[PDB]
Design a protein around this ligand. Structure first.
Ligand SMILES: Nc1nc(Cl)nc2c1ncn2[C@@H]1O[C@H](COS(N)(=O)=O)[C@@H](O)[C@H]1O
Ligand code: NA
Ligand SMILES: [Zn+2]
Length: 259
């Protein structure tokens, strides 16, 4: 069993030893250089259809927390933009910092945001998530940057349950949460082919990164930083800086949906 994390001893610079694809040709995240990304007038409109989303549970996995959805049918899907076909929402999670100046995985002209939200979807033509991650077009991850300013009301239900899942392996019922409340106003985006940003680092993701960040309050993000990487009763290691830094772009082009 693997023992990866974000510390000096088991962090991103170590991952390549168990997961050699870490040094691959389409690794994520990347820096988005806004003056090199090209507007692509042929990107179709992005369609976020979350009306029938069914959230189930929230889990501290020792790396982040995941809000899990019922993906047994087409209840919450992402279509359009660069995507062919239908991608089903399976979960969302975040990456964040110890301080507001770092936390995001993607960067924008080298700017790091305080946090990044990842809504993870799988291509329904592959039948299940485990089959989808074996395909170059198996996943679509919608990435949303968080900056610290005004509170995000649609996030507070998440923040308030975190006290009940402080430590690794803890979960809580998390029904009737509406992920539409985490979106910015604009769906303008950048897109590029990449990977999972955690082990196993599989090169199966179409990344769609929204240009407009959402604002969250310092109180909201401070509560993210009170979670623990450790399990119950173990010495406290605060769950902070659970982000992978930018990876080489290699032979890839980042496309913009907007001028
Ligand atoms: N052992 C594993 N096998 C497979 Cl098959 N998938 C896995 C995985 N461990 C994590 N995942 C997924 O990868 C996302 C992280 O990557 S991210 N930041 O969204 O790019 C996580 O939340 C999960 O969905
Ligand atoms: Na916003
Ligand atoms: Zn992620």
């Amino acid at each position: 069993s693997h023992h990866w994390g974000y510390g000096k001893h088991n962090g991103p610079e170590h991952w390549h030893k168990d997961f050699p694809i870490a040094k691959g040709e389409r690794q994520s995240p990347v820096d988005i250089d806004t003056h090199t990304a090209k507007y692509d007038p042929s990107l179709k409109p992005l369609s976020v259809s979350y009306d029938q989303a069914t959230s189930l549970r929230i889990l501290n996995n020792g790396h982040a927390f995941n809000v899990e959805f019922d993906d047994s049918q087409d209840k919450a899907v992402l279509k359009g933009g660069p995507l062919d076909g239908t991608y089903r929402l399976i979960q969302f999670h975040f990456h964040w910092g110890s301080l507001d100046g770092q936390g995001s995985e993607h960067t924008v002209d080298k700017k790091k945001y305080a946090a990044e939200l990842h809504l993870v979807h799988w291509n329904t033509k592959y039948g299940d998530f485990g089959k989808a991650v074996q395909q170059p077009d198996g996943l679509a991850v919608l990435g949303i940057f968080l900056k610290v300013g005004s509170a995000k009301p649609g996030l507070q239900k998440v923040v308030d349950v975190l006290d009940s899942i402080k430590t690794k392996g803890k979960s809580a019922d998390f029904t009737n949460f509406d992920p539409r409340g985490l979106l910015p106003e604009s769906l303008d985006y950048w897109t590029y082919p990449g990977s999972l940003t955690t082990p196993p680092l599989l090169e199966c993701v179409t990344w769609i990164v929204l240009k407009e960040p959402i604002s969250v309050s310092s109180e909201q993000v401070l509560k993210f930083r009170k979670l623990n990487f450790n399990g119950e009763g173990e010495p406290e290691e605060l769950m902070v800086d659970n982000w992978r830094p930018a990876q080489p772009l290699k032979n890839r082009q980042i496309k913009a949906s907007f001028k």
